[PDB]
């Protein structure tokens, strides 16, 4: 009977509990101890663990399927519930501690927040289909489909907050939740879909158009095959070849050259992102090092870029089209964060998206033959388009940019709803969830080869002209440098949660955001903090003082 109790939390198992939705089966309701902090995660409370399961079946794929949570529940909460988004295809379940992402030591739980995790409706250990390309195979199955999109995320909320309601006899008193990349894509669906099932919500790098990424995936894979050198096992151009690192440090060399000094500082990074955007063009920039063309005017050198790599890398960042002319994602930003280099050590955390390892003799770009090529094919493609995993790539090369991309709209059979439909969250209305107090703080990397930093930028202007004075609720925080919701030549750690708690309790907006780097040795310094800065703002030098130190730094126009 106790509240917040061993007792309580043992008799959670599963009967007095009553779960909202009634298929809910809990396997484990153990009392943990205290952990204390390690080098690389903060202390975590005593607390009440509960995993299990909601609506068990049978897939249409003969599969078994199930909605897996795992909920933590501290003895001494702070009346606050929490949920982190999921990341790839999902499928795993998490220790469920709260990751607030950006390199963070805390976790919600190590903050006392009751904290909730899910795999998304299927399972990477059990829903691997050997003839349906892996672990995404559960797109084989249509309601499976619509837990990956949506209805997981939801059930998941509303059993975490019943068993919140009973463990400790009060509801939460607010909930947030955190993701990025498809956990991002997640949080934005709960703005759209569900807007108050959270107060609170980060959405990083997200994937709100998800089922484009394939289309992305083709056309750059496409766009760069003429300058790719050699075949891979089955005739396909090495796509990884196409780019040395050293051709690639070059380019972000280049890049600097043209677009440092435009935020009025030459420090390695390109705060003026859109002043950088109009004026580099890999045809006609100056490679910095010898002030001559970064584009070979003779054979390819070192301090080069042939003629057809850089007709291959303009294309692929130009963003597909269709026969029509009509652009089927966006295009993304040149920054320099595509390279960048550490010790001895390049930066892979752009070109493993487009282009994969060059010192392999396979395929193994994400967007070639990896998985997101994979989860187009299965996942978003209506009538899926399961296959051998050594025709995907062959598959990407003969990409039809006027009938495959219809696939993501379409529906056939069993598959009731297009990926579109239930993956896609590109909704500007957002009036239920700022009008009753919610909050949404977005962040991209400008260096993100997965989901384009400048599409999510379209989104939020097109979120500014549908709902006027939007900064009021919802503000987006571009970082430069960084890639794929961390790493690169950028201030990619933050702790976004303390300043989404304040947005949504004490309505005090974010004008800036500390942020500091993973590898400050990008720059060849131990450390460096700068602002992150409000769209459309960028951060702008003072003028003296520490370059490393973001005191010396103001949010402002470029
Ligand atoms: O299908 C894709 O293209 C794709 C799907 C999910 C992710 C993701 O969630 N990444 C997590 C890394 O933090 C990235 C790309
Ligand atoms: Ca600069």
């Given at each position: 009977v106790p509240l917040a109790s061993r007792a309580a939390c043992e008799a959670l198992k599963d009967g007095d509990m009553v779960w909202p939705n009634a298929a809910t089966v809990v396997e484990v309701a153990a009392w943990?101890?205290?952990?204390p902090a390690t080098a690389s995660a903060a202390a975590l409370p005593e607390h009440c663990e509960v995993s299990g399961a909601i609506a068990k079946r049978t897939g249409i794929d003969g599969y078994p399927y199930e909605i897996k949570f795992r909920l933590r529940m501290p003895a001494e909460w702070?009346?606050?519930?929490?949920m982190e988004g999921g990341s790839g295809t999902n499928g795993s379940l998490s220790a469920a501690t709260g990751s607030i992402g950006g390199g963070q030591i805390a976790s919600a739980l190590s903050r006392n927040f009751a904290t909730i995790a899910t795999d998304g409706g299927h399972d990477n250990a059990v829903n691997d289909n050997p003839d349906a390309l892996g672990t995404v195979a559960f797109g084989l199955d249509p309601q499976a489909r619509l837990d990956m999109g949506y209805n997981s995320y939801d059930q998941v909320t509303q059993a975490g907050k019943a068993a919140v309601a009973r463990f400790y006899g009060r509801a939460a008193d607010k909930?947030?939740?955190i993701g990025c990349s498809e956990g991002g894509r997640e949080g934005m669906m709960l703005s759209q879909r569900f807007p108050s099932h959270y107060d609170g919500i980060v959405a990083g790098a997200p994937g709100y158009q998800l089922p484009k990424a394939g289309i992305s995936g083709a056309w750059t894979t496409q766009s760069l095959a003429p300058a790719a050198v050699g075949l891979d096992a089955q005739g396909v151009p090495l796509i990884n070849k196409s780019?040395?690192?050293?051709?690639?440090?070059?380019?972000?060399?280049?890049?600097?050259?043209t677009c440092d000094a435009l935020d009025g500082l030459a420090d390695g990074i390109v705060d003026n992102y859109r002043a950088c955007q109009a004026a580099f063009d890999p045809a006609t920039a100056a490679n910095p090092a010898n002030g001559q063309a970064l584009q070979c005017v003779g054979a390819k050198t070192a301090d080069c870029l042939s003629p057809v790599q850089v007709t291959a890398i303009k294309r692929a960042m130009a963003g597909p089209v269709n026969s029509a002319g009509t652009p089927l994602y966006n295009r993304w930003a040149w920054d320099a964060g595509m390279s960048g280099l550490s010790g001895t050590?390049?930066?892979?955390?752009?070109?493993s998206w487009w282009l994969g390892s060059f010192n392999s003799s396979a395929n193994n770009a994400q967007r070639v033959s990896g998985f997101s090529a994979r989860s187009?094919?299965?996942?978003?493609?209506?009538?899926?388009?399961?296959?051998?995993?050594?025709?995907?790539?062959?598959?990407?090369?003969?990409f039809d940019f006027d009938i495959d991309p219809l696939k993501i709209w379409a529906?056939?059979?069993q598959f009731t709803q297009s990926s579109m439909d239930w993956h896609g969250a590109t909704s500007t209305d957002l009036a239920a969830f700022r009008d009753r107090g919610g909050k949404m703080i977005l962040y991209h990397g400008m260096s993100d080869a997965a989901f384009s930093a400048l599409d999510t930028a379209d989104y939020y202007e097109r979120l500014g002209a549908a709902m006027p004075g939007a900064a009021g609720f919802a503000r987006l925080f571009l970082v430069p440098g960084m890639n794929h919701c961390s790493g690169g030549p950028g201030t990619d750690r933050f702790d976004m949660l303390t300043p989404l708690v304040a947005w949504v309790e004490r309505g005090e907006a974010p004008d800036q955001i500390?942020?500091?780097?993973?590898?400050?040795?990008?720059?060849?310094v131990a450390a460096r903090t700068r602002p992150l800065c409000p769209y459309p703002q960028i951060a702008r030098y003072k003028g003296s003082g520490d370059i490393n130190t973001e005191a010396n730094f103001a949010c402002a126009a470029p």
């Open positions: 943990r101890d205290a952990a702070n009346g606050r519930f929490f909930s947030y939740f780019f040395s690192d050293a051709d690639l440090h070059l380019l972000s060399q280049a890049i600097l050259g050590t390049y930066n892979q955390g752009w070109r187009w094919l299965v996942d978003f493609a209506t009538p899926p388009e399961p296959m051998p995993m050594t025709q995907v790539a062959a598959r990407m090369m003969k529906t056939s059979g500390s942020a500091w780097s993973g590898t400050p040795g990008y720059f060849g």
